[PDB]
Design a protein around this nucleic acid. Sequence first.
RNA 1: GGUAGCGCUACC
RNA 2: GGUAGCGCUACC
Length: 627
Amino acid sequence: SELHGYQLEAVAPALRGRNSIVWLPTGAGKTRAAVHVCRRHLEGRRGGRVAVLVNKVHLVQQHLEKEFHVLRDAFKVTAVSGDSSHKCFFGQLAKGSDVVICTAQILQNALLSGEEEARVELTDFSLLVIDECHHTQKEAVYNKIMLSYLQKKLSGQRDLPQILGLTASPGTGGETSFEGAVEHILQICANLDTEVIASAREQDPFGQRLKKIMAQIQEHMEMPELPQNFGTQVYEQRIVELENRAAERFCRKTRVCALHLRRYNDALLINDTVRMMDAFQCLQQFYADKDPTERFLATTFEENRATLQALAGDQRYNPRLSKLEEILQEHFQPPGSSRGIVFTKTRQSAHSLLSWLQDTAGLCGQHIRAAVLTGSGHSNQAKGMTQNEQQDVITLFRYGELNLLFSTSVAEEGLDIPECNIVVRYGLMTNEIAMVQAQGRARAQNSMYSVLAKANLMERAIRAVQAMPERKYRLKIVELQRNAVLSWQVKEARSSERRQLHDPDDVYFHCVNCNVAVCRGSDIRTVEAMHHVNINPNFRFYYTVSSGKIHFERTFRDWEPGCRIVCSECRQEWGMEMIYRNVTLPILSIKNFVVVTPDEKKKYKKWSTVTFPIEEFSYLEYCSSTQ
RNA sequence: GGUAGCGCUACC
RNA sequence: GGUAGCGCUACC
Ligand SMILES: [Zn+2]
């Protein structure tokens, strides 16, 4: 498996010592080409060091076993990830090795760390290998690393590392023009300090009924200028926008009504994508888990519950599913020869369409074993899977145990399955990058491609940049570098201005649901510049410990996640605990509180935007004061 | 779970 | 530029 010609030509500018972006197609072999640059770099000098910056946890160990292990004959290589983080300090481990393969935020933490053993600098490395370098933009981690690289470069710093970008698609960044597509590429060159870009229904009475129920509730609200466009992204914005204002001002009738009206609008969007029965069970389980406001809204649903369940059972009113069933009936006979993936927008659509397959008479008979594949992220509406669960299902898919998937956009890019031969993009509305990447998952000879929906530049830009004059290129890039560093200082100063407005004691925290005051801003401390905990011992009266302890797949260095916590009076979710070494501490989520200040009452979503200074937590300080 | 990031759609 | 929804990701 010796290098090809195009690989050798692509790395040529990197070997001379220049900052480059190696643009090659997906799966051409950018990682093997990087290894050759790394060996040729480390062979050429002493005190040489490499940081390989991936952007996914799986890519740390993938690069090692597939590619970078070959370098171990001459040079020490070590892998650092999220899962194996808590054992050793990075500063020691990185300085002890010749090559360090890690997710970018590990290095960024090490670059900011206060502890001398965990500390690191940019000057400590002499070749950064930023894999998928096109992400180096805006306020991403990649870009914040490289933005410090530029701030130092422009202040007369020397011996900053060689930059080596790997990427398949630099992209446009939402630019359909030719003028804009070039300017986008010139910014990414300025971010990475790059010098040479190298390359080779008719009737819907279920839906119509749900709209009428929302009209009755908006009449009960008694308000003018409400939005009259039900079952839309505009309505879901406006109803939550009103719910946010109702929470800030504390208007109980408007706040409780707005939460329910969204649940009806969610059902309208669930009804549009998948079954009528899926839209019904969203509202069913909402009211089942449960003042005059909630009593009216409970009675409003109770009358329409029996009707909507009959309308959902009606087979006259989804044509999408009848179309989907005919594709599955045809292609999966013989029983389990084919191998398909069905792309959906939401996790709720993915989890619904699996249960549809199980509750259908025509498809049961053909041996189709299937499952759902989503991400590891999370929110209050929907939960996801994990990296361990995803990899089990991908294995069972690859070796023919399971032969169908209802996946989200998790696996549209990256997932290689040689035996796959079917793709069904179910009612999506994405760009042609997401379209062409989705088509490529079927790796088989005679690959099918269906686009199940309802009835009724970059390549030129890169070559234009590659063919620029050297003087014009260097004068443009130095302008864009000076721009971003000035934009950074303005944005950090502007953030510092808003942070120093009020005092900690002047700022009070209220419960988002019931508006009872609970604590002051002086009580709060940040643990690792992230977790905001109340150190006042009298705070423990206000929160109650609801459920058992939460379990993640990972372990941390200093602390571990305790039980959840809720409001003593109204049982609203506040956050969770932190069992920091030997002391419990209450973690707070800003989403579940209305922060009162001298000026205004606001419903903050981020802790970065708060208007009072918050000090760093000290374990030595808290133990001394409490004991 | 907590803190961020990005992409897509939608309105302002 | 602001916000919300959804999807993906990272660190802790
Ligand atoms: Zn409360």
